[PDB]
Amino acid sequence: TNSKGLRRGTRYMFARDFRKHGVEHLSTYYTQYKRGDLVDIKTNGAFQKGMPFKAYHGRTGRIFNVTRGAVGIIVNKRVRGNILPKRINIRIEHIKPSKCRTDFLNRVKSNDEKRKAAKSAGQPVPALKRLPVAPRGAHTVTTQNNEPELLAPLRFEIVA
Amino acid sequence: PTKALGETLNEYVVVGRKIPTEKEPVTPIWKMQIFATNHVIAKSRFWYFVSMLRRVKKANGEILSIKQVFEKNPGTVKNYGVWLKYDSRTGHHNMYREYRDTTVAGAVTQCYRDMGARHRAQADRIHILKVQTVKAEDTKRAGIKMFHDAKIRFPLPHRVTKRKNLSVFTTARQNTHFA
Amino acid sequence: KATLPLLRIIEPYVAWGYPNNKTIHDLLYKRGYAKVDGNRVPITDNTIVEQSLGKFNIICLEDLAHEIATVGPHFKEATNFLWPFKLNNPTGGWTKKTNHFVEGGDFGNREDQINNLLRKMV
Amino acid sequence: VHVSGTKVKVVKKKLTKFKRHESDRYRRVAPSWRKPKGIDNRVRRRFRGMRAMPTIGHGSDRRTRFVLPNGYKKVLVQNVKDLDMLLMQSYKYIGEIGHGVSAKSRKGIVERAAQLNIKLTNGNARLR
Amino acid sequence: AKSKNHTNHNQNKKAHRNGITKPKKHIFLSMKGVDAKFIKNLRFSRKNNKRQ
Amino acid sequence: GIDINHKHDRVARRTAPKSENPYLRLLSKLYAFLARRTGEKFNAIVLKRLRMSRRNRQPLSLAKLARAVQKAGNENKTVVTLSTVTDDARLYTVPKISVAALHVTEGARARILAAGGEIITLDQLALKSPKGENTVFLQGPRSAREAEKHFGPAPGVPHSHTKPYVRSKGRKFERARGRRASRAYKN
RNA sequence: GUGAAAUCGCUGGAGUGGAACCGGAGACAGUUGAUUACGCCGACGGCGUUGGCUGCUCGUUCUAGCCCGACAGUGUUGCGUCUUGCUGGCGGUAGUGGGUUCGUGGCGGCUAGCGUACGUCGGUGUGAAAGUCGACGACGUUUCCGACCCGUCUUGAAACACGGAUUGCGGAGUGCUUGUCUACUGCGAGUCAAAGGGUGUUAAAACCUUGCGGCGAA
RNA sequence: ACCAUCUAGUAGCUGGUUCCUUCCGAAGUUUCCCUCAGGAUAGCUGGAUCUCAGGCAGUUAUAUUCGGUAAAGCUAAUGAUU
RNA sequence: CAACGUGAAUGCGAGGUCCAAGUGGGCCAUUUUUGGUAAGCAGAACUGGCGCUGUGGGAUGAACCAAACGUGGAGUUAAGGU
RNA sequence: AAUCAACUAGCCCUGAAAAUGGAUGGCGCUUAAGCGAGAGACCUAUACUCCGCCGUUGCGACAAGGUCGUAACGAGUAGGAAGGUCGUGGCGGUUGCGUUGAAGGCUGAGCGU
C-alpha cells in the first residue's frame, strides 16, 4: 500500500511551470476577494504555508471568509455516495478568480439592460434566452472561379 | 465494416466542400464518383475519401449535392478497366482488372465479387482508384480478350437441369447432352 | 447542437432518421397515445389533443403533426404530450442490429430511410 | 358452462394440480404443494421441462370464481332454519346438507327445500 | 489462505444506487468559522439598527 | 422488458385509522366523505390527522390556544386541533376560545367554559364549517419528545448534542473518556 | 375398541429391447352432466379488432433510350478518304418512350386468430332406461416435445463432495429480567400507584382505599 | 481407572432449523480489533411513514478551468549510447 | 423599503426522520495493467455480468451472442439458421 | 505466336508423432451440404405489437374493514414486510350437529393460484 503523507504523488502538481520559477508577481496579492466569490484552486509550490490538499487542486470553491492573507473556501468533495462541502483555509498565492461566474453576471447585466431599454422605448420584450446552435439554413453555392475538383483515391506507393 | 451489399451497386456523384470560415470565406469544391448500396453509404464514403485526401472531416464540411448516375445506354456491351488498391493479410497492392458489362456499376459490382472470390478481400479493404471503358484493342486480359471475336461460337456441354415444381422421384430418363 | 451529442452517445442502440409527411401522419393516427395525468390514453378524438394543447392553439391531430414537422415554438410541449410510440416489429425483419447502417446494419442514422423502416414497423 | 343469471362463460386456466416436487418419488413427501427452498432446486430455478409453480397469474376470473360446474355457488346448511339464507338468491346459490346432519334431520331438510324451491347438492343421500 | 484482497469493484454502483446527494443550499448562509472580529462587529451592528 | 425501477412504486400510507375506536373510525369516514366531495384541502388535512398515529399528535397547550385567539382577526375564528388540549398552570388569564378538538382535559375544559368559551367536536365542526371557514388550524410540538432528544448524530461525534442512553446520571455514568480533555479527548 | 403407512400374498386388466419416475399436448379406456323458448355443443354468414398474402392504377424525384445532326473510332457485311454495320462521347427532343423513387395517394382479390351492431341453421336434452349429445379424463395405457437427485457448504454440485434403505409418531428462536423504538388504549403537568388495609362465599376474582413512593415537571 | 454430581460445562467450528401466496430486494467493500473461518463500524437493503407541490439528473449545451498519460522530443536539460 | 418578473436542451414531483435484517470467502469477460517462462496462476483500474437467473442460439457449458420472466392466444422478429 | 525472369497472395499440399474405439455434434457432402462475395424468400424466444384473464402500484367514482373504473407494471438467493372465510390446540363468549351414527380411517363429485 502507499504511504499517506500530505504531498504524495504531487511531484509535478506542485512544481512550477518551465521558466516560471522565482519571484511571485504582485497582481496575485492585489486581486480583490470577497465572501461569496468563486475561485479556482491551483497550488503554488513556491509557498509552503496555507497549501491546499492535493484533492482540492484544480477545483472551484466559494469564499466564506476573508482573513489578512488567506481565504476560507467551501469546496465540494465526493466521498462515496455524498458530496461534502469541505471548508479549507487557503492562502492567496494558491487562489485565482473564477471567470465562469463573472461571465454569467455580465450576461445578467446585459439582460437587465436590454429589458429596461426595450420597456422604456416601447419595443416588444426581446428574447433573452440562450439557444442551442440550430442546423444550418438553406443557401446557394456558386461555382464561378470555383469549379469542382474531381478527386479519386490514390494508388499505393512504396515509401521506403 | 463497410460491405458491398446489394445486387448491382449504385453509382453516385457526391459534391461537397469545407464549411467557409472567416479566414477562408470561399473554399474549394470537391467532387467524387462513389459506388455504394445507397446514398447514406455514398455520403459516408465520400467523407472517408475526402478526409483522407484533404484536411477536412464531416464535422467541418458540408454536402452541396449527391445525385445518382444512371447508365446512358444499357443496351450496349462495353469493356471496363478497373484500377484498384487493396489490402491483403500481409501487405498493400495495386491491381488492374477487366470486365465486360452493359453498366459501369455492374462492372464494379463484378469487381467486388471477383476480389472476394479470388483473394478473400472484403469491401472494407478495397479502394476503387479508377474505372473506365477500354477499347477492344486496348484490353490486356485473356478472359476478356477471348470474347472479342465476331465468329464466337460454343455449345453448352454438360447441362444439368433442375426440376422445379414437381415430385422428387420420376421414371423419366435424364439427358445432359442437347445437340 | 444540444441533442446531436446524445444521438452520438446512444448510436449503437437506436435507429434514427428524418421523418417525412406520411411517416408523421401515420405515426400520429395509427399509434398516437397521449400522456393525460400520467395515463396512456389513445388519441381517438381531436378533443383529447385540445384539452391538453389547446392553450397553445393546437386543437387537432393536424395541428400536432404541423407542430412536429415544422418544429414550432411549442415543439417541446407537443412532443412531451405524446406517449413514447410503441411500434411493432417490422414485417420483413431487420438486417444486423449490431452494425451501423453504413456497415450494412441497422443502428445509427439512416437519414430518410427511417421512413422505409417505419412503413413496415408502424 | 355459464354463471347462472348471466352469460359469462366459466374458464379454467389450469385443471391439473400443483403437486409437490418429488412427491411421486418418496412416500414421506405428501403431494400437497410446498414451495421449493433449496439452493439448487431446478423447479425453483424454473428450468425448462419442470413443473410450474403456483402464481397469482393462474387465478380464475373474478366473475366465475368458486362457481360449481352446474353454475351455482355452494352454501352449507345444517338445519331447516339455515335454508332461509338461500331463499332470495336461489337463482345463484345451491344448498348442501352438512356431513354431520343425521338421516332423521335430512328428511325434513330435503322436504322443506323442495317446498321452498331451493336446489340441494346432496338431497338424495343418507336414506335409511 | 490469503485474505487481504482489496478491491473497489462494486462501489460506484452502490454509491449511485440511491443517487449522489449534492450539498444543500442553506450551507452558505451559516456564518460559522468566520473571523471573530468581523463577527463581533456584526453583532454590534445588528444590535443597534432601529426597527422604525 | 422495460428499463424502470420498482423500488419506490409503493408509498406507505394510511387509508384508515389503525385504531379500533369506532367513533374515530366514524369520524374518519365522515371526513373522507367531506374531503372527497367538497374538495377542500382543509378537509384533507383533517382526514390525514384523524388517521395519523398518536405519536404525531402531541398535546397542545391552553396557552397556545390563547395566543392564537389573541391575534388580530382571530378573535371570532374557531380553533381546530386534533391534539389533546391540556391545561397550563402558567397561564393566568384565559380569553374567549371556540375550539373543536378530539379530547380536552378536565382543567382546560373547565377554564375554557368558565371564560365564556365553547368546545365542539369534529362532527359538530363538520356542520358549523363544512369547508373549514373561519378556522385556525393548530397542533402540538411534534419534536418535543424525550425520545427525539436521543435522535440525531451519535453522541460521540463532533458537534453532537444528542442525549445518550445512560442507565443513570452522575459522575460515574459516561463522563470520563471522550467527554473531557483530561481523559484522552473531547468531541 | 379403532386398526393408518411402509412391506407383503391372491384374482382380473394392461404394459414390458441396458433404469423407473416426471411437466406440457392430444387419443383411447373410463367417469360424469344434460329445461316455441332456453341450456350443452358444432357449421355458414355479418359486424368489431389485430392481422398475413397478393394485384392493378394514377402521380412525384433523378434519368434515359428510340429518333435527328456532325465528328472520332472499329470484334464489321458486300464488292479500301468505298459501302453496309457497330461503338463513343457532343449537340438536339418535336414525337415516342421505358428504368428509379416514393406518395398526409385511388381501386381491388384470397384468407387467419380473438370477441359478439347480430343473423340463417343443424345435432342433443324435459319420466324412465337405453342410445345420443357435452365436459373431464384425475398417480391407467399409448404417442410427440421437454426432462440429471434432493438438502447443504460453496465463486462454482447431477457430481468421482457430505446426509439420505422404507414408513409412522416425536423433533428445534422459548421464558424471564432490563433497555430502546414503533403501533394501539386511558388520563394528562401529571400519571401509576407498592406493600398494606377494608370489604367480597359463583372469596386466589371483582370493588373501594395512599400528607408519604416510582417516573415526569430543572 | 471406574461411578454419580457440578453439567443442558464452553465452542469465533460442523449439522439441522417444520404452511401458502403477494410486494420490495442485497453483500463479499471502508476503518479499528492477538484480527486473518470472527466481530464492531460505514456502505448496500426492508418497513413505518411524515412534510410539502420545481428543483433536481451516472445525459447534453454554453462559459471557465484542472492534469503530464498516449503520441512527440533527445539536431532542448538529466541519464544512457554508435 | 420601491421597481423589474423566471434568462440553455431533454426528462422528471421533491425532501425529512426513525427502527432494523442479511452481508463483510467472491468469481468471470472486453479494454488497461504488475509479478511470473507460463498457467483454468497471483495482484489491481473502469464497466458489465454470474453469484441471486430462467428463456432462443453457440451439439454440450455459471459467465459467450440475443434477450431478462404473471397466466394464455394471434402476429412479427433478435442472435442463430433452412 | 507469344515467350522469359523475379516477385507477390488466395485455396490446396509438406512441415504435422501417443497411447480403450471416436468425433465440422452425427450421417454424410466434391459445378458441395466446402471456401469468399452477394440476392430473394423462409424458420424460430418467456423479446416487440395487439387481444383476454389474475394480481400489484398510482389515480379516481360511489352512502364503504366495500364495490367499481382506469393506466402502467409483474425476474429473484440472503433478507424484510403484507394478506391468509390456510391449518393445529386451549380459554372467555357466541352458532349448531350428534347411537336415525361424532372423532378417527380408506377413497368417487367438486372448489381454491
Curated annotation (Swiss-Prot), chain A:
Transmembrane segments: none annotated. Belongs to the eukaryotic ribosomal protein eL21 family. One of its GO terms (cellular component) is cytosolic large ribosomal subunit. GO terms for molecular function: structural constituent of ribosome. This is Large ribosomal subunit protein eL21. Coiled coil: none annotated. Keywords: Ribonucleoprotein, Ribosomal protein. InterPro entries: Ribosomal_eL21, Ribosomal_eL21_CS, Ribosomal_eL21_sf, Translation_prot_SH3-like_sf. Pfam families: Ribosomal_L21e. GO terms for biological process: translation. It comes from the Eukaryota. It comes from Caenorhabditis elegans.
From Swiss-Prot, chain B:
Transmembrane segments: none annotated. Pfam families: Ribosomal_L18A. It comes from the Eukaryota. One of its GO terms (cellular component) is cytosolic large ribosomal subunit. GO terms for biological process: cytoplasmic translation. Keywords: Ribonucleoprotein, Ribosomal protein. InterPro entries: Ribosomal_eL20, Ribosomal_eL20_dom, Ribosomal_eL20_eukaryotes. GO terms for molecular function: structural constituent of ribosome. Belongs to the eukaryotic ribosomal protein eL20 family. PANTHER family: 60S RIBOSOMAL PROTEIN L18A. This is Large ribosomal subunit protein eL20. The lineage of its organism: Eukaryota, Metazoa, Ecdysozoa, Nematoda, Chromadorea. The gene is rpl-18A.
UniProtKB/Swiss-Prot annotation, chain C:
It comes from the Eukaryota. GO terms for molecular function: RNA binding; structural constituent of ribosome. GO terms for biological process: maturation of LSU-rRNA from tricistronic rRNA transcript (SSU-rRNA, 5.8S rRNA, LSU-rRNA). The keyword Transmembrane does not apply. The keyword Ribonucleoprotein applies. GO terms for cellular component: cytosolic large ribosomal subunit. Keywords: Ribonucleoprotein, Ribosomal protein, RNA-binding. Binds to G-rich structures in 28S rRNA and in mRNAs. Plays a regulatory role in the translation apparatus; inhibits cell-free translation of mRNAs. Belongs to the universal ribosomal protein uL30 family. This is Large ribosomal subunit protein uL30.
UniProtKB/Swiss-Prot annotation, chain F:
One of its GO terms (molecular function) is RNA binding. The keyword Ribonucleoprotein applies. It comes from Caenorhabditis elegans. GO terms for biological process: translation. The keyword tRNA processing does not apply. It is found in: Cytoplasm. Keywords: Cytoplasm, Ribonucleoprotein, Ribosomal protein. The gene is rpl-18. This is Large ribosomal subunit protein eL18. Residues 146-187 are annotated as: Disordered. Belongs to the eukaryotic ribosomal protein eL18 family. Its main location: cytoplasm. It holds the Pfam family Ribosomal_L18. GO terms for cellular component: cytosolic large ribosomal subunit. Residues 160-170, 177-187 have a biased composition (Basic residues). SUPFAM superfamilies: Ribosomal proteins L15p and L18e (SSF52080).
